[PDB]
Ligand binder design. Sequence first.
Ligand SMILES: CC(=O)O[C@H]1C(=O)[C@@]2(C)[C@H]([C@H](OC(=O)c3ccccc3)[C@]3(O)C[C@H](OC(=O)[C@H](O)[C@@H](NC(=O)c4ccccc4)c4ccccc4)C(C)=C1C3(C)C)[C@]1(OC(C)=O)CO[C@@H]1C[C@@H]2O
Ligand SMILES: Nc1nc2c(ncn2[C@@H]2O[C@H](COP(=O)(O)OP(=O)(O)OP(=O)(O)O)[C@@H](O)[C@H]2O)c(=O)[nH]1
Ligand SMILES: Nc1nc2c(ncn2[C@@H]2O[C@H](COP(=O)(O)OP(=O)(O)O)[C@@H](O)[C@H]2O)c(=O)[nH]1
Ligand SMILES: Nc1ncnc2c1ncn2[C@@H]1O[C@H](COP(=O)(O)OP(=O)(O)O)[C@@H](O)[C@H]1O
Ligand code: ALF
Ligand SMILES: [Mg+2]
Lengths: 426, 337, 412
Amino acid sequence: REIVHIQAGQCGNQIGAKFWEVISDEHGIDPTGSYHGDSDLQLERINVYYNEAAGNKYVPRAILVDLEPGTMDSVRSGPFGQIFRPDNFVFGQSGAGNNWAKGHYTEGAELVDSVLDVVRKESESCDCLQGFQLTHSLGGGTGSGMGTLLISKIREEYPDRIMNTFSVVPSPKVSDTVVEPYNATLSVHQLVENTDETYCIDNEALYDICFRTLKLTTPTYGDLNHLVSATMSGVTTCLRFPGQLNADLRKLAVNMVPFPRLHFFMPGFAPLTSRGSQQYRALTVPELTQQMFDAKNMMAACDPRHGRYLTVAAVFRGRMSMKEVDEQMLNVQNKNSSYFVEWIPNNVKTAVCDIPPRGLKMSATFIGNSTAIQELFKRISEQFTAMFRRKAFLHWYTGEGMDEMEFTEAESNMNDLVSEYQQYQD
Amino acid sequence: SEKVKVYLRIRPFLTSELDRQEDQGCVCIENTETLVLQAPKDSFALKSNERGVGQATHKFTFSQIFGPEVGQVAFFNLTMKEMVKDVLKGQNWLIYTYGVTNSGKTYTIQGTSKDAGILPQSLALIFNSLIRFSVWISFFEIYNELLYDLLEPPSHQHKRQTLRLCEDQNGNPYVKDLNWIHVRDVEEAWKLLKVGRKNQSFASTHMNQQSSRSHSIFSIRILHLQPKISELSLCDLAGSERCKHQKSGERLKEAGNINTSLHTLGRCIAALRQNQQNRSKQNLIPFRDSKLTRVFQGFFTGRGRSCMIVNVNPCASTYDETLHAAKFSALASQLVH
Amino acid sequence: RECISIHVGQAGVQIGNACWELYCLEHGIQPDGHVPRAVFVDLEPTVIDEVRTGTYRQLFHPEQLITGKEDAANNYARGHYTIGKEIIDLVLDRIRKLADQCTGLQGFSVFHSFGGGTGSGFTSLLMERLSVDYGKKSKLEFSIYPAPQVSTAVVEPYNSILTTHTTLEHSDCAFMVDNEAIYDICRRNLDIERPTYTNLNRLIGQIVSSITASLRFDGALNVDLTEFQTNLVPYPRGHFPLATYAPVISAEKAYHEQLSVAEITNACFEPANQMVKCDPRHGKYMACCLLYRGDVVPKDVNAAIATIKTKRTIQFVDWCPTGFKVGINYEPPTVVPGGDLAKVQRAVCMLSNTTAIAEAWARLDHKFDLMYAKRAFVHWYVGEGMEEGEFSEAREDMAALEKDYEEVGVDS
Ligand SMILES: CC(=O)O[C@H]1C(=O)[C@@]2(C)[C@H]([C@H](OC(=O)c3ccccc3)[C@]3(O)C[C@H](OC(=O)[C@H](O)[C@@H](NC(=O)c4ccccc4)c4ccccc4)C(C)=C1C3(C)C)[C@]1(OC(C)=O)CO[C@@H]1C[C@@H]2O
Ligand SMILES: Nc1nc2c(ncn2[C@@H]2O[C@H](COP(=O)(O)OP(=O)(O)OP(=O)(O)O)[C@@H](O)[C@H]2O)c(=O)[nH]1
Ligand SMILES: Nc1nc2c(ncn2[C@@H]2O[C@H](COP(=O)(O)OP(=O)(O)O)[C@@H](O)[C@H]2O)c(=O)[nH]1
Ligand SMILES: Nc1ncnc2c1ncn2[C@@H]1O[C@H](COP(=O)(O)OP(=O)(O)O)[C@@H](O)[C@H]1O
Ligand code: ALF
Ligand SMILES: [Mg+2]
């Protein structure tokens, strides 16, 4: 079961570079080096994210799409940046405007054809393809825009394979852009009708969780990103290893998404203790559930406690007894029966791998599908409408060949999506 | 508003079908409006004697029911004349055929050369029913949940691309990216149907060779200025199938896609009937769930008078699928336009 | 006389390696020792490969190891229709070549874990095509039914209501072991809060060794496989009896080994040792097969059972006078060299059919229903070549098994 990562846009690229920086380490794959892997088990499944060509050069199977040179020209000129095959670099020297429509209809539309070519060359790699990974930001052109096209085409060329998407939703408190809510509403629309697994990350939730769960005084982007890359490896990659109870994308999805819409999840790491001090090593198991299921520690901005849960996926990865896990999970579902849905006897879906993160003893990826994520689409819709009404920076969209009813479409869709989420939140 | 016009028809057992297995008397007729059912089978459902295929009785309620003996001409008499008049009136109208595999839905829709179907008959009636007139035709097929335009010229490889289903200024969803041809005469429409046949996907099944892979939607919009806009749409949906067990391969995938799409209509109607009973602050409409449901939204929830053609298979094996279909129609009858 | 075994599904394959392990252990057949007589099928390579990488690697033939690189899918539908179909062919072929190669076999011991993907789907179509190609044989399947409250899969019940409908009308006798109730045994009858799947498997792998293995071996009261289905099922329905083990003492904590028959047999009827959360809340026994092995005197037995029969608290069904199949084997049990099992010189592996399952079924029926009421993950089944038929026609179906265990019992 192979897969093909996709670093759409600037953010998606920056974060992507960190995800591969991480992932490689969990497979002993040096820049241009070969398999230095501490063990031999970190090789039995490499195929899934790499490619066999020479015999010492296992190249990551990802795609780099962006209309801004600077990005691709900084990631390929650094560390592991020199591992990607030139063919993978799908750049577009055009005008990388921060406009969703400009990167989906005018500038993005051209490089798209030059994308489909590669996305087909990589899909036809080997073994059996499972799905595609897509990373990007809902606060820019090449991210929300170019990324919104890539999915609509991918999910039409292979409506069989799954589609995981890691989006960096526009943080509330402070928005790192001005058109932000526009590019968001417009991209979420296509996502909720293409991708079948979306992990919303919050630039401001990262800061928080990195300022209170990590004594880090200077949380650089690289850091933030790294945290994400650590969680997103626990999702996919992890499950591609043996284990007492192993899972995989399919199992994971067909167990977490009750309604065809797509549903949004919430990534969460387990052992999140500061280096020096904090190193209590308290990882028996009950300490992990305490963390993960807490408010703080949830990559989303909204708090689970503000909305029922639909499903949960405990992706553990560390030698442990199937008793102290499955039991605990139950206890938690009883202690917090209030918000955890009743029409579902067993919301939590326990998974237990074996091999842990290289230097750590035991970890556990958290993927919660709570209806609490409503307090995000609402936010966006608010900010959107609030400026839409006055057609704020609307002329910047239309002028790139768009429709004024298109904005309505997006809003409507995402708004209806809110309805559904509430129909099962009560 | 009025309840959806629904008619139930059954197809006669084929000689080959009869030879394979002969179990008749499953469907009986009582009154033109209603059907009485007693179905025989090799074995009944294993439980206390309840609704089984072995020997059981059931009741069907519909506007009108047709026997195995008569074909499309009977449908043309009652349905074709009145339905076309509504469209001329400017009122939107839509008719589709629903039923299990081997029900002969293509027979109702297209019809044979000797016996013209609903579409060719309605085409004749529109002229009779018919001031400036403008008319265009759109023809497309949905295969593997992807849309193709029948109008597209014949070629080795050709894809229309995904249908641009975007809601415009109008609240009701509209289908775009469809090529349109002016309708001067019936023959022009017929020609479009003929060329469309080649483009439309076809396949053979254990049940029947005629089997259509893709659902077919024929849409004709008439604009008349004494401009009134009216849309007449005739849809030929593919039926459900056991063939999935019998065959595999691409055929399995096509069946899976159809069975999922067919189910979305069923869930929608179920919600719709429930919506009919419940006053408010209840379950939402599944239109958004599937693309097919979205397009059909106007049909189910919004504007336009609707009529449905349900085909039934007298086969005992098919009984569970047919019962569900009948149940679907019964539930659909509950809600009003 | 022979019998083959089909380990299907991640769990069923993991448990298979365990159950098959104990075998060699009491047969003097080291890692690279004869040719077995079972197979391992799963749509998850990583799990089947574990038998190609871990212990007993070369003790199996790569021909009796079927794998489907595609997708496993934790759902009946996919495993049954779409994918599972593609694999069935190859699978059947093997269980038809090995069934021929032997000499007068007895049946196919199926090993699946009800609420799984390959365990639900796959098996369903396997047993179907089996009952037609070998209707004239025995079909005893040892299943692992969904834990009453500590389930795993979110869909779990769905996958078990679809596999029940097809197994009811194709299998002869399906033994069931409650996954949850196994932890209990490790806590109350072993004392250990660290039970890994590889441990739970050792339990089943033990009771089963007393089923097939030791039974197929001569003794003072041989018991053929046919005997079972005959004396264990009162009606054509694929009745699901319960598996139980007696000498489950810890080889560390307590040490009372020397526990005369009368006691080891009495420890089988106690709810805190029945390898199933089907507590005798009302379920009347209707046939029990007390399989003994080791030092056991036929008279000592024909007394310990008599005392039980007159204990009244074990209330048997009305229409059943005597329902106690005394099975005496020779070879005593076989504890893993360094597991956690005491190691006695006699054991009582009592299995039986009890109207108790009325509970277990209800609790799984309700579950299913609750979810079905909103259709939840139904679209995940439909899109894999399925419909409301398989569901609605299997809901009402099993229903008549909830009524069956009520009608055929509770009434004089
Ligand atoms: C001496 C020692 O034990 O050091 C630990 C350590 O101190 C701690 C604090 C690590 C440390 O992580 C961070 O400080 C951190 C920095 C930015 C963003 C997020 C986290 C560590 O850097 C991270 C590192 O993680 C790994 O090695 C995992 O395999 C992890 N790898 C990466 O994220 C990675 C980092 C750089 C380059 C390549 C990969 C991983 C996790 C999930 C999935 C795949 C890989 C570990 C255990 C440590 C250090 C080195 C100090 C912690 O994080 C992780 C992800 O394990 C932070 O809280 C945990 C608890 C650990 O004990
Ligand atoms: N006793 C025991 N139970 C197990 C073991 N492995 C899994 N289970 C149980 O069986 C069920 C898990 O089934 P899965 O592993 O998800 O699936 P599968 O049946 O192998 O097939 P797929 O869904 O297609 O992967 C859960 O109820 C587990 O608690 C095991 O080794 N021993
Ligand atoms: N976590 C994270 N967010 C980023 C990074 N880069 C940009 N972002 C976020 O992405 C949004 C801006 O979109 P951007 O990536 O510039 O769009 P594009 O480059 O035109 O596709 C802001 O909300 C930023 O916080 C990054 O490296 N990590
Ligand atoms: N009312 C009918 N009378 C006679 N033959 C019919 C009738 N309905 C269907 N058939 C025949 O049954 C076969 C299958 O019908 P068809 O319409 O193609 O199937 P489907 O319902 O799946 O669209 C054809 O050979 C058709 O001519
Ligand atoms: F022609 Al059919 F289902 F067989 F629509
Ligand atoms: Mg598995």
